[PDB]
C-alpha cells in the first residue's frame, strides 16, 4: 500500500464531525473543570494571596496553591525546574499562580479572575539588549562553534557583507487548543490529553502524584494540530488535572480558553541574527560569521535543543570553508518559548539566507546564480562536510533547482517582472528562489527510537498500535500503509488504535519529522515478525521453505496452493502460533558531541526549493503572494497525496511566519497579541493564487522505511522564498539596501521600500 495516494485515516470521520477530540469525549456527570489564576506582573514576589473570593465564587469545589501540591511541582521538559503553580514569585505575565476546580468550565474561569494578589514588583528583563546587559541567560554563557578561521578568511575577502536583522516569534494557533482529562482509577490515574508526547505526560503526572510510572496511563487518539506546541506545553494541564482529580476524588478536565492559551504557553523562539559573510572574486564563499541572540522566556523548556538546531542549520544549503556561530540563549520575563515546526532550523537557515542574499546584492550578481555556485556537491577522494563536520553525500540541490527553474519559468518571468516594474510606480513585483537542506533526526540521539504493537485476530483483521501521535500529518494512514504492505494485505484489514503508554512504553515525542520514519520501521519489524511466523507455519504444514511463501493482495501462496489471509491466520491460530508481536527501531549511525559541535547528528538531509512571486504597494506596504512553485524531495514517498498536503500547508505556515504573524508585548511584558483578532495567521485568500507543488521522487540513500524521507518539518523552511521575494520587490524600488525585517508586515515592508527609496 506504501506509495499510494490514499486518504487520511479519519478523513470521513473529520468530514462528518464524528471525529472525537478531548473536549468531545463523554465523561461522568461529576467531572470538574479547571482554570488557572494567572499573574499580572512580569517579575515580582507575591507578598499576599487572598483566594477567599475565589472559594466563595459559585460552583467552585476546590482551589489550589503550589503549597497544596503533593510531591513535585515541575512541568519542565528540561532537567531544570519550571513550576506548574508559582512558588512565592512570578516570572512573566500569565504565569499560573493558582488552580480552580469548578462544576463548569465557565464557573472556573469566572472564579479564576476573582483573586486578590499583592505583588512586590522587581525590574523585568523584557528585551534582548536588557537580557544581554544583565547577563540574563541560560547555560551560563553562549555556545560557540567554529569551523576553520572566519576572522582570517573575512579579512582577505574580495567581497564582504555585514548586517543584522530581527526575526519575530510565532504562535502555533492549533485549532484545538491545549486540553487534558484525568480519571482517578483505583490507586492510579488515566490521562487523556491533546499531546505530542504522552510518555512525558506520564512521566510528569507520575512525579506530580508521587506514583510509580506503571500507575499512570496516558491515552491520546488525535490532536487538532500540534506543530510542536503540544510537545511539552501539555504537561501543565495534565498535572493540574491529576492533582485536582487526586484531591477531589472525581474526574477533572482542563482546556485553555484561546486567550488563556496564548498568554500562558510558549511560542517560536524569536531571534536576532548578526552576520558577516564573505566571498572571493569567483563568488565562492570564503567564510560566514554568525551571532544568534535567541529569546527563551522565563524558563528553559526546549530552548537548548532548539538553539542547537539553529546552529546546525546555520550553513543553510551551502558549503562554507570557514564558519562560526555564537549562540546566546537569553532568559527574559516572558512566555517560555518552545518547539515549533522546524525547531530552530528555519531561524538558522534564514540567517544564512539573508546574509547570502545581502552578499549577492552587495557585489551585484543574481542571487540564484550565487546560491547555485555555493550548494554542497552532488554525490559522485573526499566529500564536503558541514561546519559540524558531518559529510553531505546525498545533496541533490544542484539538479533539483535546475529542474524547478525550468518548470517554474524562472528566467522568463524574472525578465517579465523587470519590465512590469518599470511600467508602475505605485506597485512593485518581486521573485525569489530559496533552497532547503534540513537534517532529519533528534539532535538528542537517544530519543531516536520508536516501538509498535501488532495484533492479528482470528478473523484475519489487524489492530495496529505505535508510539507516534496523530496531529493531522497523516501519520496513522502511513503506518496502516506500511503494515498492510509488509503483511501483504488490504489496508482495510488494518485498524489503527489510540496512542497508549501502556501499549507502547517509553516513547519519544512525535517530533523531528522522525514520527513516520521510526514508527514506520517499528511497525515493519512487528509485521515481519508476524509474517515470518505465518510463513514458517505454512512452510512446515505445506512442506517447503518459509521464504517461498508469498503474502500478497490478501492472499497467501505456498506449494502452488493459495489461501486467503484469514484462512492462514485461523489455521495458524488452531496450530497455536502467537498472532501478537512487538516492534522496535533505533536510528543507526548517529553520534555527535554537542559541546564541540562535531559528529553526525543526522541520518540524512531533506531537500527542496521554492520560487515565490509577490506584489507590494509602495504607498502602504500591502502585499500578497501571486504564485508559488515548489519541488520538494520526499524520497520514495510513503503517500504522495499526504506529502503534497504537508508541503502545501507547511509552506503557507512558513510564509505566514515571515509575513502577517507578529507577536507584540507592551512595556510591561503583557502579550498584546493573544487572540485571533490581533494575531493574524494566513487566511483563505492568503494562499498562493497559483500554487504548484511537485515531488522530487528519488529513493533515500540511507536505509529508511521504504526509502522515504521525513516530510513534516523541511517544507516549512520553503516559506523563506516568500520573504526573499518580498525583499526582491523592495530592492526594485531604489539603489539602497532595503533591510527588510521579519515578519514582513505591511508596516515592515513599507519601511524596507522607503529605505531602498532612501526616504529618511
Amino acid at each position: 500500500s506504501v506509495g499510494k495516494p490514499l486518504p487520511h485515516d479519519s478523513a470521513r470521520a473529520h468530514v462528518t464531525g464524528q471525529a472525537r477530540y478531548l473536549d468531545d469525549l463523554p465523561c461522568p456527570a461529576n467531572t470538574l473543570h479547571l482554570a488557572f489564576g494567572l499573574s499580572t506582573e512580569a517579575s515580582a514576589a507575591i507578598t499576599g494571596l487572598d483566594l477567599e473570593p475565589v472559594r466563595e465564587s459559585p460552583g467552585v469545589i476546590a482551589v489550589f496553591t503550589a503549597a497544596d501540591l503533593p510531591h513535585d511541582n515541575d512541568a519542565s521538559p528540561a532537567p531544570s525546574p519550571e513550576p506548574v503553580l508559582a512558588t512565592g514569585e512570578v516570572h512573566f505575565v500569565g504565569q499560573p499562580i493558582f488552580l480552580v476546580a469548578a462544576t463548569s468550565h465557565r464557573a472556573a474561569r469566572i472564579a479564576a479572575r476573582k483573586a486578590r494578589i499583592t505583588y512586590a514588583p522587581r525590574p523585568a528583563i523584557l528585551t534582548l539588549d536588557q537580557a544581554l546587559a544583565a547577563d540574563s541567560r541560560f547555560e551560563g554563557g553562549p555556545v560557540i562553534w567554529a569551523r576553520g578561521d572566519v576572522e582570517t578568511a573575512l579579512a582577505g575577502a574580495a567581497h564582504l557583507a555585514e548586517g543584522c536583522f530581527e526575526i519575530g516569534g510565532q504562535e502555533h494557533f492549533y485549532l484545538e487548543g491545549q486540553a487534558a482529562l484525568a480519571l482517578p482509577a483505583e490507586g492510579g490515574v488515566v490521562i487523556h490529553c491533546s499531546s505530542q508526547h504522552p510518555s512525558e505526560i506520564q512521566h510528569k503526572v507520575a512525579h506530580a502524584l508521587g506514583l510509580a510510572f506503571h500507575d499512570v496511563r496516558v491515552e491520546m487518539r488525535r490532536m487538532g494540530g500540534g506543530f510542536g506546541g503540544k510537545e511539552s506545553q501539555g504537561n501543565h494541564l495534565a498535572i493540574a488535572c491529576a492533582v485536582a482529580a487526586r484531591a477531589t476524588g472525581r474526574p477533572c478536565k482542563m482546556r485553555y480558553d484561546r486567550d488563556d492559551d496564548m498568554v500562558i504557553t510558549g511560542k517560536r523562539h524569536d531571534f536576532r541574527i548578526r552576520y558577516r559573510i564573505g566571498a572571493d572574486a569567483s563568488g565562492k564563499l570564503l567564510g560566514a560569521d554568525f551571532v544568534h541572540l535567541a529569546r527563551c522566556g522565563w524558563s528553559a523548556d526546549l530552548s537548548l535543543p532548539v538553539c542547537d538546531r539553529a546552529m546546525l542549520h546555520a550553513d543553510g544549503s551551502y558549503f562554507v570553508p570557514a564558519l562560526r556561530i555564537e549562540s546566546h540563549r537569553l532568559r527574559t520575563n516572558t512566555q517560555s518559548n518552545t518547539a515549533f515546526r522546524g525547531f530552530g532550523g528555519p531561524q538558522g537557515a534564514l540567517g544564512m539566507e539573508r546574509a547570502i542574499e545581502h552578499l549577492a546584492r552587495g557585489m551585484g550578481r543574481d542571487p540564484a546564480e550565487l546560491r547555485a555556485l555555493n550548494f554542497y556537491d552532488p554525490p559522485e577522494k573526499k566529500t564536503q562536510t558541514t561546519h559540524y563536520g558531518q559529510e553531505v553525500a546525498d545533496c541533490v540541490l544542484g539538479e533539483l533547482v535546475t529542474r524547478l527553474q525550468k518548470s517554474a519559468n524562472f528566467t522568463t518571468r524574472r525578465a517579465e517582472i523587470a519590465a512590469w516594474n518599470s511600467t508602475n510606480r505605485t506597485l512593485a513585483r518581486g521573485i525569489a528562489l530559496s533552497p532547503v537542506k534540513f537534517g532529519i533526526s533528534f539532535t538528542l540521539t537517544h530519543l531516536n527510537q520508536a516501538g509498535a504493537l501488532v495484533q492479528i485476530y482470528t478473523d484475519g483483521s489487524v489492530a495496529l498500535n505505535h508510539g507516534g501521535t496523530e496531529m493531522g500529518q497523516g501519520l496513522h494512514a502511513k503506518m496502516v500503509q506500511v503494515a498492510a504492505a509488509v503483511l501483504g494485505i488490504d489496508p482495510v484489514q488494518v485498524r489503527i488504535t489510540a496512542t497508549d503508554t501502556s501499549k507502547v512504553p517509553n516513547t519519544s515525542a512525535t517530533a523531528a519529522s522522525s514520527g513516520a520514519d521510526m514508527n514506520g520501521m517499528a511497525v515493519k519489524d512487528a509485521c515481519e515478525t508476524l509474517r515470518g511466523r505465518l510463513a514458517g507455519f505454512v512452510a512446515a504444514r505445506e512442506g517447503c521453505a518459509a521464504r517461498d511463501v508469498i503474502f500478497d493482495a490478501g492472499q497467501v501462496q505456498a506449494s502452488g496452493k493459495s489461501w486467503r489471509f484469514a484462512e492462514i491466520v485461523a489455521a495458524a491460530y488452531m496450530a497455536r502460533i502467537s498472532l501478537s508481536a512487538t516492534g522496535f527501531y533505533a536510528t543507526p549511525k548517529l553520534s555527535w558531541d554537542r559541546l564541540r559541535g562535531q559528529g553526525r547528528p543526522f541520518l540524512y538531509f531533506a531537500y527542496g526549493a521554492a520560487i515565490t512571486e509577490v506584489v507590494i504597494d509602495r504607498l502602504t506596504g500591502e502585499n500578497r503572494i501571486l504564485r508559488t512553485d515548489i519541488l520538494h524531495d520526499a524520497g520514495a514517498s510513503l503517500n504522495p497525496a499526504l506529502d503534497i498536503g504537508q508541503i502545501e500547508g507547511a509552506y503557507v505556515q512558513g510564509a505566514g511566519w515571515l509575513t502577517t504573524e507578529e507577536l507584540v508585548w507592551d512595556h510591561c511584558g503583557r502579550l498584546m497579541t493573544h487572540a485571533p483578532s490581533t494575531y493574524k495567521i494566513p487566511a483563505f485568500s492568503d494562499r498562493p493564487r497559483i500554487f504548484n507543488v511537485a515531488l522530487w521522487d528519488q529513493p533515500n540513500r540511507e536505509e529508511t522505511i521504504f526509502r522515504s524521507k521525513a516530510v513534516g518539518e523541511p517544507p516549512f523552511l520553503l516559506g523563506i522564498s516568500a520573504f526573499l521575494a518580498l525583499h526582491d520587490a523592495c530592492a526594485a524600488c531604489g539603489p539602497h539596501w532595503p533591510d527588510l525585517q521579519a515578519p514582513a508586515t505591511p508596516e515592515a515592508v513599507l519601511a524596507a521600500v522607503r529605505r531602498a527609496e532612501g526616504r529618511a
Partner: protein, 450 residues
C-alpha cells in the same frame, strides 16, 4: 419563555432561562459535539452553523449567536449535513477526495460553510471561506474540493427545511421596542450580538435587562426616499453590501473586507454605529459619503450628520431611552473611495481607514469629504486637510503639499496593529493613492493578476 426551531430536520422546543447562552454552548451541552470551539471570538469559523428562515439560508458563527435569535428558524449543524439515509453531501465527499482535511478540527466549520454556499449556489470561495481559519492544509486542497462539489446538484434534504414555520424582550415592531426601551433605558440592546457576545465569552460579564432586535422586520429595511436611501439599523452588513453593489460600489468594496462572511450575515449597521468604535469601518465610509443618522426615543425622532453622533472616545450623542433607528445615504456618491489598511487583507481590524470623497468643478476641488477610522478616539473628518484642499487643483503635487495638515488633524496611537508613525504615514499615503486611482493609475495590490 420557550422558543422552537428546526434542529437538523427535527423540530425542537427549548425553555430559555439564560438569555445570554451561546448556540455553541447549547449544541455541545446537547451532545452535538461536531461543532467545535476554536476561539469563541468570531475569527476562526470553527463553530460555523447553517441557519435558514424566510430570507434564505446562511452560514453563521455559533459562538456569537445567542439562543433567542434562532427562534422560529431552521438550524443545521455538521452532524446534519449528510443525508438522513447516510449519503454524504457533494461537499463532504469532495473534501475526502481532494484531501481538504488534515487534523480535521476546522473541517466541520468548512463543510457547513461550503454546504451553505452550495445551497445558495455561491462560488466566491475566497470571501465566503475567509471566516474559516485553517492551520494545516494551506487552503489549496479545500478550493479543489469546493470547485469539484460545485458541479453537483444541491442537497435536497437541506432544502426541505425551507418548509418550516410557514426573561428577554423580543419586539415585533419598531414601535414596540420604542415603548419598552423608553421604560427600560439601562437595557442591553442585542442586534447582531457580534460585539455584545464578546463581553460574556471573553470579558466574562453578565447582562441583565436584555432585548433582541433581530426579530424586527421594519427596523431591518432598505427603502427608497425621494432624496436617497433609508437604511434601517437592523439591516445586516452582508445585505448592505449586497444593496450597495449597484449605487455605491465603493461601499460594497469596503464591506467585502468587513469582518467575515459569517459575521456579516448577522452583524448590523445600527450596531456598528451604536458601538461607537474608532476602528469601526461603517462610520468613516458613511461620513465620507455624507450620510445622516436617525435616532429614535419612543415617538421622538432626531436626525443629524453621522459624524456629529460621535462626540468622544467611548462617548456618543445618545439620550436615555434613545436608540439608533436608521441612516440615510444620498442616491449617488461617485467620488467616494474606501481604503482599509491592516496586517492581513481578509477578516481584520483596520489600523487606518481612509475614506476620501472629492467633487470637481473641472480640474478644481469643490467639496472635500475626507474621513478616517483608527486615527483618533472617534471617527472624524480631516478638517484642516479638507479646508486647505478646497479651491486647489486636483493633482498630486497640491495634495502632497497639504499632507502635513493631516498631522494637525490627528495624533494617532501606537499598539500591536500599527505604530503612530505608520498610521500617520498611511493616512498621508491614502491621499496620494486617491489622486492616483482617480487619474487611472494602478494602485490596488489586490487587483493584480498572477
Amino acid at each position: 419563555m420557550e422558543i422552537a426551531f428546526l434542529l437538523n430536520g427535527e423540530t425542537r422546543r427549548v425553555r430559555i432561562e439564560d438569555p445570554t447562552q451561546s448556540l455553541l454552548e447549547w449544541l455541545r451541552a446537547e451532545g452535538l459535539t461536531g461543532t467545535k470551539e476554536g476561539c469563541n471570538e468570531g475569527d476562526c469559523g470553527a463553530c460555523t452553523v447553517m441557519i435558514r428562515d424566510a430570507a434564505g439560508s446562511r452560514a453563521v458563527n455559533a459562538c456569537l449567536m445567542m439562543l433567542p435569535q434562532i427562534a422560529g428558524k431552521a438550524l443545521r449543524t455538521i452532524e446534519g449535513i449528510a443525508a438522513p439515509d447516510g449519503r454524504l453531501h457533494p461537499v463532504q465527499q469532495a473534501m475526502i477526495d481532494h484531501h481538504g482535511s488534515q487534523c480535521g478540527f476546522c473541517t466541520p466549520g468548512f463543510i457547513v460553510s461550503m454546504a451553505a454556499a452550495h445551497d445558495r449556489d455561491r462560488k466566491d470561495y475566497d470571501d465566503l471561506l475567509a471566516g474559516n481559519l485553517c492551520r494545516c492544509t494551506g487552503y489549496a486542497p479545500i478550493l479543489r474540493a469546493a470547485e469539484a462539489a460545485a458541479g453537483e446538484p444541491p442537497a435536497d434534504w437541506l432544502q426541505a427545511d425551507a418548509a418550516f414555520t410557514l426573561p428577554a424582550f423580543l419586539p415585533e415592531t419598531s414601535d414596540a421596542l420604542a415603548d419598552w426601551y423608553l421604560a427600560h433605558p439601562e437595557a442591553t440592546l442585542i442586534a447582531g450580538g457580534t460585539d455584545v457576545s464578546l463581553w460574556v465569552t471573553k470579558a466574562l460579564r453578565d447582562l441583565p435587562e436584555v432585548a433582541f432586535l433581530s426579530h424586527c422586520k421594519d427596523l431591518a429595511q432598505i427603502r427608497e426616499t425621494p432624496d436617497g436611501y433609508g437604511i434601517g439599523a437592523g439591516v445586516t452588513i452582508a445585505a448592505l453590501r449586497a444593496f450597495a453593489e449597484g449605487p455605491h460600489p465603493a461601499l460594497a468594496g469596503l464591506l467585502r473586507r468587513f469582518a467575515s462572511e459569517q459575521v456579516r450575515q448577522v452583524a448590523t449597521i445600527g450596531g456598528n454605529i451604536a458601538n461607537g468604535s474608532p476602528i469601526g469601518d461603517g462610520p468613516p465610509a458613511l461620513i465620507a459619503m455624507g450620510a445622516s443618522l436617525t435616532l429614535r426615543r419612543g415617538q421622538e425622532r432626531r436626525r443629524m450628520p453621522l459624524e456629529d453622533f460621535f462626540l468622544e472616545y467611548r462617548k456618543q450623542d445618545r439620550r436615555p431611552g434613545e436608540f439608533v433607528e436608521s441612516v440615510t445615504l444620498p442616491k449617488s456618491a461617485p467620488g467616494l473611495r474606501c481604503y482599509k489598511l491592516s496586517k492581513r487583507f481578509d477578516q481584520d481590524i483596520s489600523a487606518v481607514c481612509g475614506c476620501l470623497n472629492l467633487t470637481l468643478k473641472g480640474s478644481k476641488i469643490e467639496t472635500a469629504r475626507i474621513a478616517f477610522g483608527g486615527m483618533a478616539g472617534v471617527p472624524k473628518r480631516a478638517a484642516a486637510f479638507e479646508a486647505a484642499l478646497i479651491g486647489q487643483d486636483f493633482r498630486e503635487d497640491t495634495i502632497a503639499a497639504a499632507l502635513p495638515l493631516l498631522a494637525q488633524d490627528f495624533t494617532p496611537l501606537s499598539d500591536m496593529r500599527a505604530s503612530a508613525a505608520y498610521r500617520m504615514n498611511a493616512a498621508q499615503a491614502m491621499a496620494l493613492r486617491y489622486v492616483r486611482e482617480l487619474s487611472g493609475e494602478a494602485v490596488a495590490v489586490l487587483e493584480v493578476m498572477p
